[PDB]
Ligand binder design. Structure first.
Ligand code: ANP
Ligand code: ANP
Ligand code: ANP
Ligand code: MG
Lengths: 915, 403, 409
DNA sequence: TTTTTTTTTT
């Protein structure tokens, strides 16, 4: 709380400003680094260390006394070296709250016994000398605890002699009884053993967040060599007129009344955390916040590691905070915690997978202790606004309000520059606020941060009211007329500037200035990059591990896009799940084909690279083609799935410049399908290999420039007629799969045909719009994805399915002539190796095509290149003359006769976990 | 404190206090009859999740019904309010019912509320009014008549509910019309809101006339001077523009545009809105909270074969299509144009030699459906090849939202 | 105080960190030199970044200039407290009042906008944009800038004044032959090209992709005999060079006939300022056009656009499975073409009895080309090969002795 | 403003 008092005094007290100007301009010639032997005076408010000579020491004492004359607050400590004045510090615990008066008779008796101890325990200079004593008392007793000081500037002693005197005094029964009779209930431990060497407080100064001691009276002791028995003590008078700063200084050499008695002579680690706190207010706020965490966060390894990672990610130099936090449990820290802290900090400097920051720490502190967190953070807000109010005499401006707003809500809004060069605001949607369906726990995009607009006029006005209350309280306090006039002027200016926060232009300016503070570099770049995180209607779904986890709590994953479907665990007994499973059983009769189709459609969840396959559907109509594909698109939503125009796959592309928003619809999509085609349709093979391959594609979007993105969509196509594929490329055909429909739905099915079923309009008219069936199907998809990951390591290429492979082979054979030649005539016979040259095989192909298919004039080079385009690469080795030779196969050259050489029981979705 | 939870809500929510004052004006039938009581409970639950004490207090207006299963009734109605996604009413209906059943008491209560809000704002800041203060008061005055939401273009769009009597286009009664600029709000800021400032001036002058300490009189005189200086700014164009720009954040309603005109069973007509959810169809001539914007200029009336125009149309239909079964099927197919949702994958091809009434009936259907629900389509949209890759196609865009 | 005074002081304070120039659109564009320890994108250190709005300057106006303002206030108060004649004291009091009136304007949005608008004239540097990335011997990398103007190549991790804006995210490391990724890439590359002379010639040609200036422009007809799986190495070269320095091109550019007198062409606008260009995956066995070769293989300014003209700097590679058809006898075309045929495939279920079929590994394509370590290892390999070529044959690929390439051509 | 549309190309 001392910050407010310090700023106010530096504002309305001109003498404090003069003292600071001296310390920063004229005494600046005597700076000393911490730990230097020359240091004699330290200002721990700013942490600086100084070394001032006698004349400059007198000047400094004069200026503090002038500041002390006006009642200012400060904290200056003189560094007691090897030789200085003796010091005695007492902390009194009392039977009751009654203050021990420390009467001058009692003080005289105590001083007499102290002199007896010092004279019998140390040598004294010859002749007659006078020793000055002073006593500063605490302002109040708290819970029966009190304190007072016995400082002796005149008795110049060494540290060892002072420590011996302190120990003897503590163990002396006479002094203990003297203190006890006055009211001290703990005379044996009241005196601080370290009082010999602790720095001495200059009079008028007070400890940080502590009230200053009050000087009660002074005493002078006279002793003589010729009279070592009698100990006269005289009470010092006129104590109000002396420069008490100089006269109470233990190390002082040029005191007005204090004369030196030349009698007998004989860690930065803690400072680093304070340095970090002073040079960074956020570090101080975090240190205040971290104390609210329960003990589990520094005892259990996972929570402690999370805290360490968050601190390291917040700032690279926040290590002292982590070290201090780990020291909450000395046992765990000492038993290997140091090495663990080293390793964790190194990993945080290395790793990039645990992305947590101070937002999580703030959330944990708020959850565990809401009221204390609120009080601390509101005190922080008031403190931050206080410097801006005081320094500029109440004339608040846009930048001041933007800074306070960032301090108030910095962990909820992020602004980044998009491709257009315009600043775009993002907000993290917490529960219990107006929001669209399904956008909870995600970063939503806002054209204009209206929530911040409301927040400026609704919540910041409370801090304004607190500032006004503070000013009114200071006005009511009795002060100097000049101080009252200054506070009146400040109140008038602040009231003039108080209503600006309700103005439209002022708020626009504040938010425009706040865009610079909330800016986070590369935020859009990392948005929605992680393919294992999928946004859902009730949180975010994480498929990083098996089983998948639903996150219904705070998180910092940069996720923006989402689907409205709420995720629920897979349950076969749900009526909608049973209905959907029966529908799947009805749509696809073959068990292996159904399993392969469901495994393939499960990969639509994953938005990353995959095995580069495309599915072709064949069906005459009314066989569920549109239902299943559209259900997948509906459950995946618009952001992750979209219908695609077939011309995008069957035509020559537009110039790179030409936007092609239809092509830009493939960005970020895990699934895409074309529901419509023509009778006569030739799919373009260059488009096909361009869109099914795992790689980069480029196109422009409306109001944007050139851009490249990875192609990560699951592609499905359906039609009433077979597509035309005008190529024999083995690389093209391995990318394709084909399936043909069997079951047909009709209003009046023939009972003698197992492939005719009664249609139910509800499937497409109602059972695709009910959210319940949608989310049940999403659960089924998640379950099938998990099953694929746990049984085939996610590789769809290794799924066993005779029906799909047989139908794809038939489909290819119906168009690829050379494939027919190889399949029907070129048998792979190890018993009939008969090494052939490529020209011989080309002649065989020409003969077969002429005799069996059609007469045609062939080209040897083209035919050779085309059998280089087939499965013959398994056998086409290199001859010694480097000529292509076929090996290990027999050719049926011309009209040669060929020569040698499961059903589910109860749960089809759980079929064969053992293969 | 559980019995005092109602007062705990009162001290924290001014809107709850205003509703409690309003709810006392409802006639006894709204807590005696089950339908009206259920409607009130649903509206209270939809307005706020924590408004349960208000519903419990209101249900106690008839203790005999409350004791005889009323508590369990209130509990399952509260649960169904979260369960039911079709019963969409809010505090707007409660305010309308209270205004209908007691105009003077409702008027005085709500005017007292306006005066209290404005007086608090004036006293808190010594009469220096700003845009957000008048925006807050205007939202209090018309929080249930204007709604603003961000369209697809990133531009805030104002919507207004049209009531009888006010100037309007023909057929837009009982619907949310779209306002480029909130004209009525601009008029209301200067015309109606100015009378509350007159009440503030009367209050200040009355306190000035009251005998007080000289310091109090000086403070009130300074406050009066500041308020008179700030009073004329409500007639300034720039000040009103800023006030309305700030009011867009208070009138904001998330997902309003998303749900606009999505229900296919609700059809906007010239004299209200037509609901075809259940047979017979019902016409809504009264206040409602259905988010309906598009409409047709046709005024709906119940079917009557004795109407001369109905007789003429039936005779014309008989003349055009001779066969009875064909006529019934054609009328059934054309009737599906009323419904704007998913329907059977059918198309009708009609062939004729010419001058045989084909375009008469086909165009009459589109004339009676209006432009927002029906449209003529280009033949090239059906007999020509699709445009190459991506090109804008406004002809195909005409298909959105049309039956 | 007014806008120009604060603009002058801001230029005096940060004149060596921000530069503004007028682009082709007539808009003043701010550029900032990115020093270590400040918020930035990954890899933009030690380079000039384009700023639509000088955010850092906006912060610096209100965060650091206020300290100079405070120093001025301290000076004024010190003179005010000094014993002076009443006239001087009144003058200083008036000056302090006026300064305090003007002190708070530096936090105003309109005032800061005006200050920055006036500062756009002081920070202006003529022809700054025209000199950006013009030096071909300087290559921007993730951890600084790589200089290939001297042997060996040198990486800069300190202050410099080279006008570099574009860069690749690949971080440069010295070529370590014992690095695991380096060993893997070297073994795979040895597997790809069986002939040693052909391997050295191919790597020396491919290493010229780093240099962005003029070069011999010899097209390489890499016929992937055996359907090797050509995507790996060729896409890896473009991946390590990045989009700013490498370009993907369509085979339709070489087989399509020359355009009409007004029809726009989409290929040359994506071809300018690049160090590498590649054509891949032929399946139609397309016949190439001689005018399309002349449109690019000869050194000079290309003219077709979507009109606009510029120089040719891309290293070109043509990948084929099935032979192209060159329908000309022109010795001027044949002297600029080079032909090579591969003999190795890496595919699924190879025969163990021959070395020319090897087991495929899909994780190569799925992760390793996306693995930063593999990419930077390959970049180090490319840098080493460029250094070896420069130090052995003076960088001319014409004089590289390779019997295999000559015989196959 | 500024872009997209239109224009231009298929
Ligand atoms: N599991 C099912 N059980 C019963 N009826 C079903 C089922 N699945 C789909 N339907 C019916 O199938 C009818 C047509 O299916 P739909 O998927 O729209 O046709 P389609 O096969 O795509 N034919 P097409 O539109 O010509 O492409 C729907 O109207 C439903 O009545
Ligand atoms: N019920 C009716 N009784 C008598 N005349 C009628 C009737 N319905 C329509 N007509 C008239 O018949 C004429 C033909 O109507 P219209 O609908 O324009 O023709 P159409 O069948 O669409 N012919 P077309 O477009 O020329 O091939 C018009 O003059 C109508 O007014
Ligand atoms: N050196 C190698 N060792 C082992 N496997 C390899 C090697 N190089 C490539 N492969 C694998 O061989 C396959 C060929 O991949 P890819 O380079 O995409 O082939 P491609 O025929 O050029 N493809 P595309 O142009 O897309 O049709 C992949 O499974 C690679 O992982
Ligand atoms: Mg269909």
């Amino acid at each position: 709380h001392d910050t407010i008092q310090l700023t106010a005094q530096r504002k309305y007290l001109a003498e404090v400003q003069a003292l600071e100007t001296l310390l920063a301009r004229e005494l600046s010639v005597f700076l000393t680094e911490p730990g230097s032997k020359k240091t004699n005076i330290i200002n721990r408010i700013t942490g600086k260390t100084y070394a001032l000579p006698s004349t400059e020491l007198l000047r400094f004492y004069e200026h503090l006394e002038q500041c002390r004359k006006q009642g200012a607050l400060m904290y200056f400590l003189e560094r007691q070296g090897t030789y200085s004045g003796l010091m005695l510090d007492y902390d009194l615990k009392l039977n009751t709250n009654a203050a021990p008066s420390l009467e001058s008779s009692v003080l005289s008796r105590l001083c007499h016994r102290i002199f007896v101890h010092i004279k019998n325990s140390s040598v004294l200079p010859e002749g007659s000398h006078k020793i000055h004593f002073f006593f500063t008392l605490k302002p109040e007793a708290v819970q029966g605890k009190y304190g007072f000081h016995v400082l002796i500037p005149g008795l110049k002693m060494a540290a060892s002699t002072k420590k011996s005197i302190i120990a003897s005094l503590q163990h002396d029964a006479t002094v203990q009884k003297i203190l006890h009779e006055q009211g001290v209930a703990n005379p044996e431990s009241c005196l601080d053993p370290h009082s010999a060497s602790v720095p001495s407080l200059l009079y008028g100064s007070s400890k940080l967040n502590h009230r200053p001691y009050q000087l009660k009276t002074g005493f002078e002791l006279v002793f003589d060599s010729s009279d070592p028995d009698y100990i006269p003590i005289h009470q010092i008078k006129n104590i109000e007129s002396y420069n008490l700063v100089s006269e109470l200084s233990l190390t002082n050499e040029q005191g007005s009344l204090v004369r030196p008695v030349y009698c007998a002579a004989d860690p930065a680690d803690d400072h680093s955390l304070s340095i970090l706190m002073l040079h960074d207010p956020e570090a101080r706020y975090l240190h205040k916040i971290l104390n609210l965490l329960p003990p589990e966060y520094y005892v259990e390894y996972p929570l402690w590691s999370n805290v360490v990672f968050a601190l390291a990610n917040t700032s690279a130099n926040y290590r002292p905070l982590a070290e201090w936090f780990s020291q909450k449990c000395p046992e765990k820290w000492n038993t290997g915690g140091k090495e663990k802290l080293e390793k964790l900090w190194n990993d945080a400097s290395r790793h990039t997978e645990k992305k947590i920051t101070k937002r999580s720490i703030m959330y944990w502190a708020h959850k565990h202790a809401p009221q204390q967190y609120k009080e601390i953070v509101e005190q922080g807000y008031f403190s931050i606004l206080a410097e801006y109010v005081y320094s500029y005499n109440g004339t608040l401006e846009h930048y001041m309000i933007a800074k306070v707003i960032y301090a108030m809500m910095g962990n909820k809004f992020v602004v980044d520059v998009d491709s257009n060069g315009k600043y775009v605001w993002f907000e993290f949607v917490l529960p219990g606020q107006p929001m669209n369906q399904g956008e909870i726990w995600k970063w939503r995009k806002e054209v204009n941060p209206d929530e911040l607009h409301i927040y400026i006029s609704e919540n910041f006005s409370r801090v304004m009211d607190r500032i006004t209350e503070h000013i009114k309280y200071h006005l009511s306090q009795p002060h100097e007329t000049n101080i009252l006039n200054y506070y009146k002027k400040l109140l008038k200016a602040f009231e003039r500037s108080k209503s600006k926060i309700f103005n439209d232009s002022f708020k626009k300016g504040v938010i425009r200035q706040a865009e610079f503070l909330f800016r986070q570099r590369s935020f859009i770049q990392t948005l929605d990059t992680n393919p294992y995180l999928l946004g859902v209607g009730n949180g975010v779904l994480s498929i990083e591990t098996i089983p998948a986890k639903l996150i219904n709590h705070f998180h910092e994953h940069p996720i923006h896009q989402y689907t409205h479907i709420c995720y629920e665990p897979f349950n076969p007994e749900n009526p909608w799940t049973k209905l959907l499973l029966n529908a799947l059983q009805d749509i696809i009769p073959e068990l292996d084909a159904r399993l392969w189709i469901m495994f393939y459609l499960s990969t639509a969840i994953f938005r990353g690279l995959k095995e580069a396959l495309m599915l072709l559907w064949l069906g005459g109509g009314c066989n569920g083609k549109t239902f299943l594909m559209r259900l997948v698109a509906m459950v995946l939503g618009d952001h992750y799935a979209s219908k695609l125009n077939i011309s995008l796959l069957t035509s020559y592309r537009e110039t790179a410049e030409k936007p092609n928003s239809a092509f830009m619809r493939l960005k970020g999509r895990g699934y895409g399908y074309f529901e419509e085609t023509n009778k006569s349709e030739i799919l373009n093979t260059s488009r096909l290999k361009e869109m099914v391959n795992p790689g980069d594609v480029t196109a422009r979007e409306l109001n944007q420039k050139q851009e490249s993105f990875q192609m990560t969509a699951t592609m499905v196509a359906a039609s009433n007629y077979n597509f035309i594929i005008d190529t024999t490329d083995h690389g093209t055909w391995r990318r394709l799969r084909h399936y043909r429909s069997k079951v047909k739905f009709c209003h009046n099915p023939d009972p003698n045909n197992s492939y005719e079923k009664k249609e139910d309009p509800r499937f497409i008219h109602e059972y695709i719009m009910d959210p319940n069936c949608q989310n049940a199907f999403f659960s089924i998809l998640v379950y099938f994805w998990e099953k694929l990951q746990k049984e085939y390591n996610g590789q769809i290429k290794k799924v066993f399915c005779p029906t799909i492979e047989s139908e794809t082979e038939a489909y290819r054979k119906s168009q690829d002539t050379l494939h027919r030649f190889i399949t029907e005539r070129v048998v792979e016979s190890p018993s009939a190796e008969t090494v052939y040259n490529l020209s011989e095989v080309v002649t065989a192909y020409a003969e077969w095509y002429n005799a069996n298919i059609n007469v045609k004039r062939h080209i040897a080079l083209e035919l050779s290149q085309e059998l280089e385009n087939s499965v013959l690469e398994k056998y086409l080795q290199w001859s010694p003359n480097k000529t292509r030779i076929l090996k290990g196969c027999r050719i049926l050259h011309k009209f040669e006769t060929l020569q040698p050489g499961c059903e589910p029981k109860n749960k089809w979705w759980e079929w064969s976990p053992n293969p």
